[PDB]
Design an enzyme around this catalytic site. Structure first.
Site, PDB file in Angstrom:
ATOM      1  N   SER A   1       0.784  -1.227   0.000  1.00 42.34           N
ATOM      2  CA  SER A   1       0.000   0.000   0.000  1.00 42.34           C
ATOM      3  C   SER A   1       0.812   1.270   0.000  1.00 42.34           C
ATOM      4  CB  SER A   1      -1.036   0.029   1.137  1.00 42.34           C
ATOM      5  OG  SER A   1      -1.993  -0.991   1.018  1.00 42.34           O
TER       6      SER A   1
ATOM      7  N   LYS B   1       0.033   3.741  -2.662  1.00 48.20           N
ATOM      8  CA  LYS B   1      -1.017   4.735  -2.553  1.00 48.20           C
ATOM      9  C   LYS B   1      -0.467   6.160  -2.465  1.00 48.20           C
ATOM     10  CE  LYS B   1      -4.524   1.668  -0.639  1.00 48.20           C
ATOM     11  NZ  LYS B   1      -4.012   0.310  -0.309  1.00 48.20           N
TER      12      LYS B   1
ATOM     13  N   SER C   1      -5.883   3.293   4.268  1.00 45.47           N
ATOM     14  CA  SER C   1      -5.445   2.417   3.167  1.00 45.47           C
ATOM     15  C   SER C   1      -6.648   1.810   2.405  1.00 45.47           C
ATOM     16  CB  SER C   1      -4.550   1.308   3.741  1.00 45.47           C
ATOM     17  OG  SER C   1      -3.607   0.855   2.774  1.00 45.47           O
TER      18      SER C   1
END
Length: 326
Positions: free
Chosen positions: A33, A36, A88
């Site tokens: 993640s 991101k 997330s």
């Protein structure tokens, strides 16, 4: 010495970008993640943060962490970006991607074109969230530090990344940031982003500041990441300081010469160094040779008479023009 449990790690000086410590920092790895961060950068730069996003069925289907979007929900893009970064949310990631990029394919194109522009030569994106749903979605500790340095130029990224608690403007949620460095562990933390998948293991980007020194740390595949980030930041804050290499104004090494009081630099040159590194810094000046005709007539002297080059081993860590007072 710095010892970490990460397979790959890096810490860089947020000012200069200089690598201060690195471990296998160019090995391509799954990143989960921390992907991101790129998604957030593109949303912030899109100019669409106050637009209403309509959430698709595809966004709702996404696996993993979520902020519990529903099909057809109307949510402000800004809210999604906070949900993305603090929680997330993979649903948020796909909704952002489809809104900002038109489609996942469009957004991923944008992600890669941005990676190219930033010089992330060992990075390839296939999605906006870092789930392991493709081959060839990867980055490196070094490339992720480059991206984070870029992201931290954005005032909105700075703000979002440092936010502990957020009340959504258009959703009935309050979100707490999952970055434990920021919320509980480390008083010097200024932000960051966690990741975990079964294949990537723990990944972490984080930032910290103390006494005017801004640092960026990345770990990829590290079961001890929170501790390791603190160890890395503490090591740098303990062993490095910002030195004034050259002060604004006149140039001491030109004393006794023609340029003694009239040659000047327009700003301080500062740099983050260890004591031992500071011993290996050299101030080189290249100046025009004064001509006899300059004695009588100041108008023949150009406004810039040379350049000062600060060398660290064979790195040019700074270069500035040397001016001559009008």
């Amino acid at each position: 010495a710095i010892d970490v449990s990460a397979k790959s790690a890096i810490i860089i000086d947020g000012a200069s970008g200089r690598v201060l410590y690195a471990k296998d920092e160019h090995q391509k790895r799954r990143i989960a993640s921390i992907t991101k961060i790129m998604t957030a950068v593109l949303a912030i730069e899109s100019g669409k943060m106050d637009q209403t996003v309509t959430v698709s069925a595809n966004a709702v289907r996404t696996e993993g962490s979520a902020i519990y979007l529903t099909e057809g929900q109307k949510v402000k893009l800004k809210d999604l970006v906070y949900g993305l970064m603090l929680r997330s949310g993979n649903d948020a990631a796909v909704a952002i991607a489809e809104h900002v990029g038109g489609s996942l394919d469009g957004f991923v194109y944008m992600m890669n074109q941005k990676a190219e522009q930033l010089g992330m030569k060992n990075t390839r994106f296939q999605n906006p969230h870092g789930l392991d749903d493709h081959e060839n979605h990867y980055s490196t500790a070094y490339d992720m530090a480059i991206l984070t340095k870029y992201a931290m130029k954005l005032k909105d990224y700075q703000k979002i990344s440092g936010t502990k608690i957020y009340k959504a403007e258009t959703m009935e949620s309050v979100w707490k940031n999952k970055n434990k460095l920021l919320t509980m562990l480390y008083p010097y933390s200024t932000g960051g982003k966690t990741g975990y998948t079964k294949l990537a293991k723990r990944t972490l980007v984080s930032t910290a500041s103390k006494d005017g020194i801004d640092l960026i740390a990345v770990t990829i595949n590290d079961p001890n990441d929170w501790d390791d980030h603190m160890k890395m930041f503490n090591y740098v804050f303990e062993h490095y300081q910002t030195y004034l290499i050259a002060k604004k104004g006149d140039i001491p090494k030109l004393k006794g010469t023609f340029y003694e009081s009239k040659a000047f630099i327009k700003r301080d040159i500062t740099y983050l160094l260890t004591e031992e590194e500071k011993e290996n810094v050299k101030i080189n000046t290249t100046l025009l040779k004064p001509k006899k005709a300059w004695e009588k007539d100041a108008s023949k002297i150009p406004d810039i008479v040379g350049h000062m080059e600060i060398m660290f081993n064979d790195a040019t860590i700074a270069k500035v023009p040397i001016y001559y007072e009008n």
